[PDB]
Amino acid sequence: XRPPGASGXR
């Protein structure tokens, strides 16, 4: 998916 924790700074 896009794990919040870091999907890069976004």
Tab-separated table of N, CA and C in Angstrom:
chain	number	residue	atom	x	y	z
A	1	UNK	N	0.852	-1.220	0.000
A	1	UNK	CA	0.000	0.000	0.000
A	1	UNK	C	0.856	1.226	0.000
A	2	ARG	N	0.718	2.180	0.956
A	2	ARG	CA	1.594	3.285	1.226
A	2	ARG	C	1.762	3.450	2.717
A	3	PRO	N	2.324	2.487	3.527
A	3	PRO	CA	2.490	2.619	4.958
A	3	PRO	C	2.746	3.973	5.546
A	4	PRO	N	1.815	4.716	6.227
A	4	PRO	CA	2.210	5.886	6.972
A	4	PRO	C	3.174	5.534	8.057
A	5	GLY	N	4.321	6.227	8.166
A	5	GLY	CA	5.553	5.800	8.773
A	5	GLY	C	6.639	6.315	7.919
A	6	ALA	N	6.484	6.208	6.580
A	6	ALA	CA	6.986	7.078	5.559
A	6	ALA	C	6.697	6.476	4.233
A	7	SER	N	5.916	7.163	3.364
A	7	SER	CA	5.734	6.873	1.965
A	7	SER	C	6.548	7.857	1.183
A	8	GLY	N	7.755	8.182	1.692
A	8	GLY	CA	8.519	9.389	1.450
A	8	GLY	C	8.004	10.509	2.330
A	9	UNK	N	8.130	11.865	2.127
A	9	UNK	CA	7.618	12.840	3.070
A	9	UNK	C	6.233	13.297	2.736
A	10	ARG	N	5.199	12.419	2.661
A	10	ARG	CA	3.877	12.727	2.125
A	10	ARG	C	2.737	11.889	2.606
